[PDB]
Design a protein around this ligand. Structure first.
Ligand SMILES: [Mg+2]
Ligand SMILES: [Mg+2]
Ligand SMILES: [Mg+2]
Ligand SMILES: [Mg+2]
Ligand SMILES: [Mg+2]
Ligand SMILES: [Mg+2]
Ligand SMILES: [Mg+2]
Ligand SMILES: [Mg+2]
Ligand SMILES: [Mg+2]
Ligand SMILES: [Mg+2]
Ligand SMILES: [Mg+2]
Ligand SMILES: [Mg+2]
Ligand SMILES: [Mg+2]
Ligand SMILES: [Mg+2]
Ligand SMILES: [Mg+2]
Ligand SMILES: [Mg+2]
Ligand SMILES: [Mg+2]
Ligand SMILES: [Mg+2]
Ligand SMILES: [Mg+2]
Ligand SMILES: [Mg+2]
Ligand SMILES: [Mg+2]
Lengths: 64, 50, 79, 76, 71
RNA sequence: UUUUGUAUAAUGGGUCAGCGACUUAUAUUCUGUAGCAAGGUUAACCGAAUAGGGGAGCCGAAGGGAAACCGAGUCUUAACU
RNA sequence: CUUUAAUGUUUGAUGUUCUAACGUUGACCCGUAAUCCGGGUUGCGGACAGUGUCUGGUGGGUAGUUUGACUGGGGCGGUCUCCUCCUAAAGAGUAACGGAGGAGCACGAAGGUUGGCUAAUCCUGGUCGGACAUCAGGAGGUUAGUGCAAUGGCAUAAGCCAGCUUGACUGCGAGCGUGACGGCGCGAGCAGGUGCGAAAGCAGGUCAUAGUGAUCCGGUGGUUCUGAAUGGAAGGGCCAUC
């Protein structure tokens, strides 16, 4: 049987040119008024997954 | 807590608004300031809204 | 509250409503005393004490609006 | 027992010491008050943190009529 | 939609490049409707692209060999 | 065997002989080795059939962006030194 | 067009009457040599009762489960996130049901500039007035003050007093600090507009450190980015926000 991908993860990480994964920053969904504009704008661009958590992601998306 | 969120709608007709907290009890008067509107790229007057 | 009739008929219904609300208030007060005594009682061994009962008592601590201005005799300082 | 709570450590202190070559913008000291005042070629943030304003060498000095410690960056 | 390498234009047909003549040489999928020619390979022959969306960089390379890009 | 730690008065075993526990499809990643090499390889199936056909298809040679889209660049942005 | 006053007239409700649906665990006859069942006459009810679908109430009668952790054994008691000091051994970090205190905010000015000013306490004199109110001059030297705990700061004031004000701006960001990660913090400088000042300049909130909550699901504005034959639309996506 082919490995079933974790469908939740395929909605949050996208592969890149070299082999790293790109994800979206958290803390940008709701009650933001207390957050400084500097903090809001620094979370807008998409980030890349760190070193420690890379192992747990390749497990979830074998085919991606 | 007695300060409740308000939004400062713009006055250039575009859809753009800031948000802040205002004491609706001791300041019943509405706010209006001069803020930047990045749609028309000008310093226009921002009036108080819902 | 919509009432169909005249002022004289509606005034009695208004008074009845106030009397019933005061009676229900007193009943709720007495219930709160009775449950507070049980909350403050002991434990009697290694037994329950009823977390569900505690939650019910905590829920029973609600609030109601006293009639905003049942204003009474004003003040006039003679000179 | 009533007490028994505490706050996370804020990790303040001197991050770069004397004679250390820094790059522009690097933090020199994380501060609560102003124990170290801003000399030439350094800044002062809202958190009273002293950040480098030009790459060089860190130099602690005691200039001033009240003997208050100053940090300034030599240009190298 | 599918990419097209520049080098792939040498395996197509007697000169014309088109959606049907691209997929008749197993360069693109059968159900690929749109395509775009990319500066990735090298060409020498005078290929005439029938209808496609060759880029700005690759257009200056097709005509260099002697091609023609019409619609 | 389990433990910080056992001659331990902690566990197991009366003794011999026979049996008794990391395996098997499929899929994916890495390593070694072998074949070809900007190419590599077939599946079902056909077949006097471990040959030979079958290139449907899969991976790779191009990336960026949520997407249209652009393209060795792209996204952000009114625009980037 | 206005009030109503009538007779027709459709519908709705509340009733009374009837017989033909339906009930009969009333009587008689037949199948039949059968207190079952069926059929036929005859009464008694009768559009009720009863059953089917939908629906509100009740329902431990029955069934499926839940009922946290730390803990000088468990239970009872206390506690669970954030800030300040000490323990903490002169970098950073460092435990216990160790020793002491706070937070779940506030402010369209208590924010930004430009001007100006500098406290607590004590003494002498003086109308009501004293131990202490306001005035005068001497010692004084921060024992003062900070919007709210404590520590570190503050005279160039970060404390006090006024003018004009909205930078409590939009897009970015060299480079660093701290985290296992999620994340959090500091930031010169660049571009577009802006306030204060004669300018040099300062301003991307408040002397700093607490004043908080991921994801999912959904709500409200903007944007043809997408739109399942095509044109639209619904629904998604992106930005702002709840
Ligand atoms: Mg959103
Ligand atoms: Mg093919
Ligand atoms: Mg061991
Ligand atoms: Mg033991
Ligand atoms: Mg021994
Ligand atoms: Mg033994
Ligand atoms: Mg023995
Ligand atoms: Mg045992
Ligand atoms: Mg034994
Ligand atoms: Mg691509
Ligand atoms: Mg039960
Ligand atoms: Mg079960
Ligand atoms: Mg326990
Ligand atoms: Mg030490
Ligand atoms: Mg230390
Ligand atoms: Mg202030
Ligand atoms: Mg000043
Ligand atoms: Mg100030
Ligand atoms: Mg403060
Ligand atoms: Mg359509
Ligand atoms: Mg939408």
């Amino acid at each position: 049987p082919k490995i079933k991908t974790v469908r939740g993860a395929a909605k949050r990480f996208k592969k890149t040119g070299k082999g790293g994964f790109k994800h979206k920053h958290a803390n940008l969904r709701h009650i933001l008024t207390k957050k400084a504009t500097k903090r809001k704008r620094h979370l807008r661009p998409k980030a890349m997954v760190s070193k420690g958590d890379l192992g747990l992601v390749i497990a979830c998306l074998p085919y991606a | 807590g007695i300060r409740e969120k308000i939004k400062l709608v713009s006055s250039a007709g575009t859809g753009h608004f800031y948000t802040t907290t205002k004491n609706k009890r001791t300041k019943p008067e509405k706010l209006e300031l001069k803020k930047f509107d990045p749609v028309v790229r000008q310093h226009v007057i921002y009036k108080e809204a819902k | 509250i919509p009432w169909e009739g005249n002022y004289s008929s509606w005034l009695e219904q208004k008074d009845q409503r106030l009397a019933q609300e005061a009676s229900q208030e007193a009943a709720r007060r007495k219930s709160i005393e009775k449950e507070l005594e049980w909350v403050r009682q002991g434990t009697k061994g290694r037994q329950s004490k009823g977390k569900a009962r505690l939650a019910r008592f905590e829920e029973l601590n609600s609030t109601e609006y006293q009639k905003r201005n049942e204003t009474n005799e004003l003040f006039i300082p003679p000179g | 027992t009533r007490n028994g709570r505490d706050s996370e450590a804020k990790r303040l202190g001197v991050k770069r010491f004397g004679g250390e070559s820094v790059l522009a913008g690097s933090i020199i000291v994380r501060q609560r008050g102003t124990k170290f005042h801003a000399g030439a070629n350094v800044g002062c943030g809202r958190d009273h943190t002293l950040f480098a304003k030009a790459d060089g060498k860190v130099k602690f000095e005691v200039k001033g009529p009240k003997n208050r410690k100053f940090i300034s960056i030599e240009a190298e | 939609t599918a990419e097209i390498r520049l080098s792939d234009l040498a395996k197509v047909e007697g000169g014309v490049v088109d959606l049907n003549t691209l997929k008749a040489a197993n360069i693109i999928g059968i159900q690929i409707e749109f395509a775009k020619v990319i500066l990735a390979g090298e060409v020498t022959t005078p290929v005439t692209v029938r209808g496609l969306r060759v880029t700005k960089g690759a257009r200056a390379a097709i005509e260099a060999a002697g091609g023609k890009i019409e619609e």
